[PDB]
Amino acid sequence: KKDGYPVDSGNCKYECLKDDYCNDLCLERKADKGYCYWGKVSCYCYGLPDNSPTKTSGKCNPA
Numbered sequence: 001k002k003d004g005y006p007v008d009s010g011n012c013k014y015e016c017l018k019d020d021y022c023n024d025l026c027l028e029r030k031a032d033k034g035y036c037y038w039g040k041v042s043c044y045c046y047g048l049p050d051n052s053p054t055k056t057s058g059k060c061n062p063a
Contacts, residue, residue, distance in 0.1 A: 001030070003046040004054035005037075011053065012060030013042040 005013030006029040016022045016036035022043035026034025029052065031045030048054060 001047045005042050006045050006048055007055050013055045016043040
């Protein structure tokens with residue numbers, strides 16, 4: 001497992017506004033804990049699956 005920005009199949013890291021939205025959405029992502037790294041970024045989990053597809057080196061391209 002590992003921390004990072006959980007991205008859906010499109011490679012889009014879920015965003016957030018508070019820290020509880022990240023911790024929750026994070027638990028669903030299989031992460032133990034997670035907050036919302038604002039700084040113009042998105043949520044942040046801690047415990048995502050190894051293969052857990054997270055922001056790699058591209059942009060959230062729909063389709």
